[PDB]
Automatic annotation (TrEMBL):
The lineage of its organism: Bacteria, Pseudomonadati, Pseudomonadota, Gammaproteobacteria, Moraxellales. It comes from the Bacteria. It holds the Pfam family Transpeptidase. Residues 28-237 form the Penicillin-binding protein transpeptidase domain. GO terms for molecular function: penicillin binding. The keyword Hydrolase does not apply. InterPro entries: Beta-lactam/transpept-like, PCN-bd_Tpept. This is Class D beta-lactamase OXA-160. It comes from Acinetobacter baumannii. Keywords: Signal.
Length: 243
């Protein structure tokens, strides 16, 4: 890689242009944030976290003894938006499937009051979870910079939760293994006032133990497959030589 920064920026901008979306992908190396993509001003704008919030819901539920990691959440038998959710599952399984009913149940066990306190204590986003404990991941919003930093915190065990709570949640987030590098992350897709947001927020753990946090953020459009979030992310990390 004698590749110019101009060429990196152009290549990653083109992965967003080809998907016909507007988005950004923030990469963090040590303390330095780099911003890539075809809509850089997204970096400090606020969007609903949607399902990226499952990472924090899990940390809170575990820290506070609302569940354990091997506990099986039974499917209640009612029809689900997706068949894959019609099954009994652990928090970790529900993370990978982004299964809402499980994370909703966990949120209800935690309850609105404790969820409020705990979201303030962690200072996640704008920190407002409103009056509904299972529908809030509006008015809670967060920026892509704030997401990559949250990812940075979790990857290095700096959030204010016990170490073992943080390691337990990190084990849930492994979504890919590419050439001795592991990718931990959580996806999101939220409907906002007039637009949809897509997220993929996590970190690359390299063979040598180095951790590189990232947050992809983009506009989802009718018709898009969700796996475009992953594909843009993996191409970008690869172009940068990070995986
Ligand atoms: C998690 O992000 C989850 N997203 C949602 O359930 C929300 N969805 O809105 C969609 C896009 C499905 C819709 O058209 O209604 C949501 C939660 S809070 C908010 N403002 N919107 C998805 C399905 N899981 S994921 O892994 O695909 O991201």
């Amino acid at each position: 890689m004698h590749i110019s920064s101009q060429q990196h920026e152009k290549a990653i901008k083109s992965y967003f242009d080809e998907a016909q979306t507007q988005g950004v992908i923030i990469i963090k190396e040590g303390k330095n944030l780099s911003t890539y993509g075809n809509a850089l001003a997204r970096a400090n704008k606020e969007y609903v976290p949607a399902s990226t919030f499952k990472m924090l819901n899990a940390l809170i539920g575990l820290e506070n003894h609302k569940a354990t990691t091997n506990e099986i959440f039974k499917w209640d038998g009612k029809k689900r938006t997706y068949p894959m959710w019609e099954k009994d599952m652990t928090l970790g399984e529900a993370m990978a499937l982004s299964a809402d009913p499980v994370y909703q149940e966990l949120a209800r066990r935690t309850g609105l009051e404790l969820m409020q306190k705990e979201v303030k204590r962690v200072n996640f986003g704008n920190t407002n979870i409103g009056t509904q404990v299972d529908n809030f991941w509006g008015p809670l919003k967060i920026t892509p910079v704030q997401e990559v930093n949250f990812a940075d915190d979790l990857a290095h065990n700096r959030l204010p939760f016990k170490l073992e709570t943080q390691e337990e949640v990190k084990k849930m987030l492994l979504i890919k293994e590419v050439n001795g590098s592991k990718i931990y992350a959580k996806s999101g897709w939220g409907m906002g006032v007039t637009s949809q947001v897509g997220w993929l927020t996590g970190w690359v753990e390299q063979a040598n133990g180095k951790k590189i946090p990232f947050s992809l953020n983009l506009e989802m459009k009718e018709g898009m497959s969700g796996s475009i979030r992953n594909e843009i992310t993996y191409k970008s990390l690869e172009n940068l030589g990070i995986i």
